[PDB]
Amino acid sequence: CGKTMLAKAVAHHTTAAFIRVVGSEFVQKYLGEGPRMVRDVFRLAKENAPAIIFIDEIDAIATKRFDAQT
Amino acid sequence: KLLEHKEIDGRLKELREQLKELTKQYEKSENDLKALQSVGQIVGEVLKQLTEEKFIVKATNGPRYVVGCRRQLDKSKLKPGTRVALDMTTLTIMRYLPREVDPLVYNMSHEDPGNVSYSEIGGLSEQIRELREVIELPLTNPELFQRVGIIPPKGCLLYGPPGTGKTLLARAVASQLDCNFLKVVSSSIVDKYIGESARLIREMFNYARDHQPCIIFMDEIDAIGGRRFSEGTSADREIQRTLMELLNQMDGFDTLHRVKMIMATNRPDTLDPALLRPGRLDRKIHIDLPNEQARLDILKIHAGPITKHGEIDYEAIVKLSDGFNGADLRNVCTEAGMFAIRADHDFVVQEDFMKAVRKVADSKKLESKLDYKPV
Amino acid sequence: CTKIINADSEDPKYIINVKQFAKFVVDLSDQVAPTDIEEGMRVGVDRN
Amino acid sequence: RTRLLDSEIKIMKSEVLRVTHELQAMKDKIKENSEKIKVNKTLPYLVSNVIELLDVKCAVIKTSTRQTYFLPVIGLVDAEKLKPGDLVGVNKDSYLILETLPTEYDSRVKAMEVDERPTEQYSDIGGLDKQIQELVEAIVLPMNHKEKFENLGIQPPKGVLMYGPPGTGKTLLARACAAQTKATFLKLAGPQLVQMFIGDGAKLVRDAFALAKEKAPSIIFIDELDAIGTKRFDSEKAGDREVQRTMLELLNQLDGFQPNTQVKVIAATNRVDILDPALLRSGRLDRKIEFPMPNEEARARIM
Ligand SMILES: Nc1ncnc2c1ncn2[C@@H]1O[C@H](COP(=O)(O)OP(=O)(O)OP(=O)(O)O)[C@@H](O)[C@H]1O
Ligand SMILES: Nc1ncnc2c1ncn2[C@@H]1O[C@H](COP(=O)(O)OP(=O)(O)OP(=O)(O)O)[C@@H](O)[C@H]1O
Ligand SMILES: Nc1ncnc2c1ncn2[C@@H]1O[C@H](COP(=O)(O)OP(=O)(O)O)[C@@H](O)[C@H]1O
């Protein structure tokens, strides 16, 4: 329904900084890389400018239940 | 004199006999002595430029590091985004390297053993032309599209009953270029590790962007497709994650140019509408059960290697055939052949075909008969 | 502990899994005859 | 004859000098195999999967302990036989390749081929001449008379399934055809390819059929496929899907891309309507054979 092109248009038309990442790269081969992957991008957003960060596919990262044994 | 010259020539030949062995000995000695200092083995990736001599790198195992360079490595060429080699002990950059090949992609890069042409296939030629409209015409003649001012279609999918000419096209289309063709079973991608399916398909798409003419192919996508889940099991998590990420990799913040996705599945009734979307997958192509003239042409194609006396009405087999696959006719030919191979008949009598049709008929009396139309 | 993976010709040079640590080929030792090695078995194997 | 005598003296001197140079070269080879054995007698060989072959001649590997690596000097192994995707032994200290491993097959895949070779004969089977005869011509004749098919010229029939009520007897025919062929025979349990390490069953499928490809005279039999052949379906919030990957890779690797006529799949089940139509399609398995009930004389023969 145009959910991507809205982000495309506001990223093309913004004056301040903007950043994006595909919403699945927060899982990595080794342990604990993902917390770094979110903390550093938040830190860069803080450091850089009055910027805007875009996150997509939260269902890849936000579910309802969990199995803390896998 | 002559004997002396013969002795001199033989001695020179004996001396030069070990010359290749001496060259191999020197090469192996140099290889071992260099291997004493060829230990500079570990691979990392650079992050950012602190100074011209201060750099930050990340190992492919774990932690990041701070590393410098020797003074003849073109430090301006070390942009953020390139792979590099490291020392262990001093942990220093020795050499920038180009992008990796990730040999899983290599395993289906150019391994194609098929060489079948469009003569071997038949009965669906207008669908072949329809596929050629997106797979061949814009790659060689893109100019008409910007004359009419629209982007050529991004990809297409195929569907139909099982065994009804898809991969014939796919092993028939695969016999055209053999260099821009990558082709996966939609099953080797998944792995017991954490998230490496996403990594491998990421570098797969990166390889597709590396060589601008490339045709990707995933068949039996049901194994990755599904509809969705509300977390029954736990494997659904990362396989759906791989799916979602594949979607954002095919139409997210990128001009996927000169890369075409042709799909194949047995039943599209179990696919995500996100994957089914016309913006995502442009044209859906159905392959039906072959028609009577199509069945005729198919069995005539499978009437290539036949030895017999020709008194055969192909129309009789065609008329008795109804609802038959694009492949079971070749089985019918084979099974009349095994009628010939018993009772020592090098030829095939005309009758053995029709009973073979009867022989296949009851064999498909146990079918499921599910159309499974796309939604 | 260890895990046997595959045999080899002539001199022993068997392939050993640990559990997930490493997957590599050695000859272990010589104090027993090389006939007790079959795939699907666990030997007490050192690290060096 | 002074020139001839001078030529003979020069020939003798050149022969002596060549003998001395060859002796020095042989001593150099002695130091060579000395250094090669002292870098080779480190029997610990951590293996690695080769990744790429660079040129600016150079190579990339990935070790067993999950570390990517680049080496400029390939080493003792020549690279023309080297192709990416293989696996080779590597020195622990130098991280240099030294040898070449043959293959890599799973241990559970190893422990499938027949070692005891069960002894059965056709006279143990009563009232079942037709089914046994058609199995024999569908299996042994593609194994023993290839030119018989080729002279007329056809592909052999590929894929046999037998079905029927469980008390009917078919397994025994698997043991008999094991007894009769002098070829490699691999056997699978039904759900043996059900692992929760994701895609491990896919690895089992590809490993088993790769080993089957390795033995060119060979036949592959699986008992009780209705565990894996359960029909796929559309549902939300519930539904097994690991068996979908296992069944899909099974069906594809037996029939689909890169068709191959070297192994024959033999497929047992006790019911048919559970089975997914994709595997029983037309040529993914060819001969569907039913076991009839022992009607009146077969019972007496069997007892
Ligand atoms: N106003 C619009 N409404 C619908 N589609 C539009 C509109 N403007 C442009 N499009 C194009 O029509 C198609 C539908 O939108 P698109 O495919 O981008 O889905 P999206 O909603 O943007 O992405 P997603 O649903 O995955 O977040 C695309 O080719 C899009 O670029
Ligand atoms: N239209 C056709 N013309 C000729 N042969 C056909 C046709 N359709 C199917 N076949 C035969 O079907 C067999 C299987 O072909 P292929 O592997 O391409 O299957 P597919 O149609 O892509 O379907 P599936 O992957 O579900 O089996 C081949 O032996 C091929 O000759
Ligand atoms: N001549 C025969 N004909 C039919 N069945 C037999 C005969 N001889 C023995 N049997 C029985 O058939 C069985 C063969 O196993 P089978 O039932 O085919 O396995 P499954 O049920 O797993 O397919 C044996 O256990 C045996 O008791």
Coordinates of C-alpha atoms in Angstrom, one line a residue, chain A residues 19 36 41 43 63:
Chain A
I19 CA 19.6 6.3 8.1
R36 CA 26.3 -3.7 19.4
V41 CA 23.5 3.0 15.2
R43 CA 24.9 6.4 19.1
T63 CA 7.3 -11.8 18.3

